[PDB]
Enzyme design. Structure first.
Site, mmCIF file in Angstrom:
data_model
loop_
_atom_site.group_PDB
_atom_site.id
_atom_site.type_symbol
_atom_site.label_atom_id
_atom_site.label_comp_id
_atom_site.label_asym_id
_atom_site.label_seq_id
_atom_site.Cartn_x
_atom_site.Cartn_y
_atom_site.Cartn_z
ATOM 1 N N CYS A 126 6.673 -9.343 -5.580
ATOM 2 C CA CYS A 126 7.764 -9.453 -4.332
ATOM 3 C C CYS A 126 9.061 -8.628 -4.803
ATOM 4 O O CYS A 126 9.597 -8.172 -4.072
ATOM 5 C CB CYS A 126 7.978 -10.919 -3.941
ATOM 6 S SG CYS A 126 8.051 -11.858 -5.171
ATOM 7 N N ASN A 143 9.507 -8.630 4.691
ATOM 8 C CA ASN A 143 8.959 -9.228 3.826
ATOM 9 C C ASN A 143 7.773 -8.350 3.361
ATOM 10 O O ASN A 143 7.559 -7.295 4.017
ATOM 11 C CB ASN A 143 8.362 -10.566 4.209
ATOM 12 C CG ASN A 143 8.080 -11.431 3.343
ATOM 13 O OD1 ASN A 143 8.018 -11.675 2.027
ATOM 14 N ND2 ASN A 143 7.435 -12.479 3.829
ATOM 15 N N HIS A 199 11.005 -16.169 -4.042
ATOM 16 C CA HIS A 199 10.196 -15.153 -3.510
ATOM 17 C C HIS A 199 11.559 -14.234 -3.274
ATOM 18 O O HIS A 199 12.694 -14.329 -2.697
ATOM 19 C CB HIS A 199 9.660 -15.512 -2.183
ATOM 20 C CG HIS A 199 9.059 -14.583 -1.249
ATOM 21 N ND1 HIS A 199 8.109 -13.910 -1.785
ATOM 22 C CD2 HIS A 199 9.299 -13.966 0.054
ATOM 23 C CE1 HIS A 199 7.449 -12.808 -0.919
ATOM 24 N NE2 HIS A 199 8.227 -12.952 -0.062
ATOM 25 N N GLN A 218 1.923 -6.886 -0.805
ATOM 26 C CA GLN A 218 1.863 -7.120 -1.963
ATOM 27 C C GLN A 218 0.378 -7.568 -2.453
ATOM 28 O O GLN A 218 0.156 -7.516 -3.668
ATOM 29 C CB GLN A 218 2.842 -7.925 -2.729
ATOM 30 C CG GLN A 218 2.619 -9.250 -2.221
ATOM 31 C CD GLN A 218 3.950 -10.258 -2.509
ATOM 32 O OE1 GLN A 218 4.901 -10.147 -1.864
ATOM 33 N NE2 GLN A 218 4.074 -10.893 -3.388
#
Ligand SMILES: CC(=O)N[C@H]1[C@H](O[C@H]2[C@H](O)[C@@H](O)[C@H](O[C@@H]3[C@@H](NC(C)=O)[C@H](O[C@H]4[C@H](O)[C@@H](O)[C@H](O[C@@H]5[C@@H](NC(C)=O)[C@H](O[C@H]6[C@H](O)[C@@H](O)[C@H](O)O[C@@H]6C(=O)O)O[C@H](CO)[C@@H]5OS(=O)(=O)O)O[C@@H]4C(=O)O)O[C@H](CO)[C@@H]3OS(=O)(=O)O)O[C@@H]2C(=O)O)O[C@H](CO)[C@H](OS(=O)(=O)O)[C@@H]1O
Length: 213
Positions: A23, A180, A160, A17
């Site tokens: 996110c 992630n 997050h 990102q």
């Protein structure tokens, strides 16, 4: 049981990102990417930049919710592919192009808050589930290996968004397998194992959702 959608082909490569707080857009596309493969049998990189730029319901690289992402795709009658709407790491004006459409959505479904058994079932039956967590801690940033646990994790501090691509057990330690969006150099090739059924560590099941398709 053990489920890992990476091994079922349901999961694209780990993206980065950058500095943008997008996110939520990567989490959302990830759940979408998985449902598209479920329905069609094809695996395609969907377009976080589409969401960042066009979900007014959200704050771009300043944050946002997964649900509003899913809701946008439905109302918009689709989301572009990465290739048709490439990520650039900053908010811009909505450039959504219907010719580039790669996926659709009938809205979304929400996991009962803090219910890790409910999250387990949804991951098994559905596929990759979008979740939000406390990722503020030094231990999270410098995670390398093992089942991630931090006594100081705050479940009421969801900062997050990521993607639960599966769940499992390592050496008797139950975990969630988590994709992630900080690149393949963060963590374990971009992934983290996070503690499962340890009193909803890091708010793992506090804000979990998936798109209907
Ligand atoms: C023919 C065959 O092959 N037989 C095998 C034999 O079998 C296996 C079978 O193969 C497996 O599929 C099965 O899998 C489990 C699965 N359970 C079952 C029976 O499928 C489990 O599932 C969930 C289930 O999906 C869900 O419906 C149930 O939930 C209801 C619950 N809902 C919620 C939201 O909670 C509901 O809630 C209540 C609250 O609890 C209350 O607090 C509140 O007040 O009210 C609400 C409400 O009423 O709304 O309550 C309901 C009833 O009260 C339900 O709850 S219930 O489950 O208690 O009934 O919850 C289930 C759960 O356990 O969470 O998921 C597991 C993993 O996620 C398993 O799935 S799987 O592993 O992916 O398959 O198990 C069968 C089994 O083992 O018996 O197995 C045999 C030997 O083991 C033979 O196999 S072999 O010899 O060949 O090896 C045989 O061949």
């Amino acid at each position: 049981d053990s489920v890992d959608y990476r091994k079922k082909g349901y999961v694209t490569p780990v993206k980065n990102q950058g500095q943008c707080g997008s996110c939520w857009a990567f989490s959302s596309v990830g759940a979408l990417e998985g449902q598209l493969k479920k329905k069609t049998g094809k695996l395609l990189n969907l377009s976080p930049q589409n969401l960042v730029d066009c979900v007014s319901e959200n704050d771009g690289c300043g944050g946002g919710y997964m649900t509003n992402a899913f809701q946008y795709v439905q109302k918009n009658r689709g989301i572009d592919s990465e290739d048709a709407y490439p990520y650039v790491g900053q908010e811009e004006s909505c450039m959504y192009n219907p010719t580039g459409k790669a996926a659709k959505c009938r809205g979304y479904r929400e996991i009962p808050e803090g219910n890790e058994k409910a999250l387990k079932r949804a991951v098994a039956r559905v596929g990759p589930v979008s979740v939000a967590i406390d990722a503020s801690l030094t231990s999270f940033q410098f995670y390398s290996k093992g089942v991630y646990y931090d006594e100081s994790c705050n479940s009421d501090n969801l900062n997050h968004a990521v993607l639960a691509v599966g769940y499992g057990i390592q050496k008797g330690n139950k975990h969630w397998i988590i994709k992630n969006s900080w690149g393949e150099n963060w963590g374990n090739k971009g992934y983290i194992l996070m503690a499962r059924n340890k009193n909803n560590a890091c708010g793992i099941a506090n804000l979990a959702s998936f798109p209907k398709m």
